[PDB]
Design a protein around this ligand. Structure first.
Ligand SMILES: CC(C)(C)OC(=O)N[C@H]1CCCCC/C=C\[C@@H]2C[C@@]2(C(=O)NS(=O)(=O)C2CC2)NC(=O)[C@@H]2C[C@@H](OC(=O)n3cc4cccc(F)c4c3)CN2C1=O
Ligand SMILES: [Zn+2]
Length: 198
């Protein structure tokens, strides 16, 4: 018992910058700082933007602010706290059945607005700042207009699908692939986030 370890916090290590005319990834913390911050849960870096790049000791993925909550996938974060300026912050939402977790959005972050357009022309934002057109095919699936190897999508769970007007439509959860080629993506619809918030 005396030697049982604690898991680290999720740490924000960068962002996908969507503020201008060009989407691009920025790193804000390197590996040594990430490891230290995961242990203390104390991250004094300034946070900006809607889409964060996040890491644990073993994985890296995305997290997206919508309605004042920073959302990501359970299969990346588990039940972990997130690092913040005053120490670890406990999840305010956890739903393994939806593959969804959320923490209060970091000070400095900006939130996407939930889409009410009812549009099926979507855009997936990856951890490499690719903006991939996706045609909505149901409540929680969309097809890639141009299929890609799953290598391209790995590490982007937790990122957003957006409508033409830049509203949040969903959170990327899983790739639908055959022979290593992603033809479609599954996502957690924003309506499901809004229900979880109640
Ligand atoms: C569901 C279906 C149709 C059978 O498909 C698939 O299972 N396909 C696979 C294809 C894997 C190849 C890589 C694909 C590339 C990118 C994938 C987006 C991604 C990712 O980037 N993760 S990550 O590297 O950032 C990672 C660090 C965070 N997610 C995954 O890998 C997830 C994770 C795992 O699924 C889950 O644990 N759960 C738990 C769930 C609970 C409820 C509901 C769910 F659906 C759940 C899905 C399998 N996954 C797939 O996608
Ligand atoms: Zn919209």
């Amino acid at each position: 018992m005396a030697s049982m370890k604690k898991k680290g916090s999720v740490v924000i290590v960068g962002r996908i910058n969507l503020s201008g005319d060009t989407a691009y990834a920025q790193q804000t913390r390197g590996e040594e700082g990430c490891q230290e911050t995961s242990q203390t849960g104390r991250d004094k870096n300034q946070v900006e933007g809607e889409v964060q790049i996040v890491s644990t000791a073993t994985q890296t993925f995305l997290a997206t602010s919508i309605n004042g909550v920073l959302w990501t996938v359970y299969h990346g974060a588990g039940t972990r706290t997130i690092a913040s300026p005053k120490g670890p912050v406990t999840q305010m939402y956890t739903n393994v059945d939806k593959d969804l977790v959320g923490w209060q959005a970091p000070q400095g972050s900006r939130s996407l607005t939930p889409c009410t357009c009812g549009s099926s022309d979507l855009y997936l934002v990856t951890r490499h700042a690719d903006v991939i057109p996706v045609r909505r095919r149901g409540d929680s699936r969309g097809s890639l207009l141009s299929p890609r190897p799953i290598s391209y999508l790995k590490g982007s769970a937790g990122g957003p699908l957006l409508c033409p007007a830049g509203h949040a439509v969903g959170i990327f959860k899983a790739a639908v692939s055959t022979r290593g080629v992603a033809k479609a993506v599954d996502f957690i619809p924003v309506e499901s986030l809004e229900t979880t918030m109640r």
